[PDB]
């Protein structure tokens, strides 16, 4: 799992009548999953170490 993140929360009072705000974020992420755990194959997982 590997991610590069960013965040900008911003709040402001424009005048005595209106208050605006914007909280915005972004990310670039890389996932990968071990999709053999939960099944009984011959040499994989903790079933394979046992």
């Amino acid at each position: 799992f590997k991610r590069y993140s960013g965040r900008l929360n911003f709040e402001s009072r424009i005048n005595e009548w209106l208050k605006v705000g914007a909280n915005l974020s972004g990310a670039i992420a890389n996932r990968r999953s071990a999709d053999y755990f939960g099944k009984y194959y011959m040499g994989s997982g903790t079933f394979g170490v046992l």
């Binding site: 053999y36 099944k39 009984y40 194959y41 011959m42 040499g43 994989s44």
Partner: peptide, 13 residues
């Protein structure tokens, strides 16, 4: 893997 061994029970919850 290969040659899946059998007699497992299904998992609900």
């Amino acid at each position: 893997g290969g040659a899946t061994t059998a007699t497992t029970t299904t998992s609900t919850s």
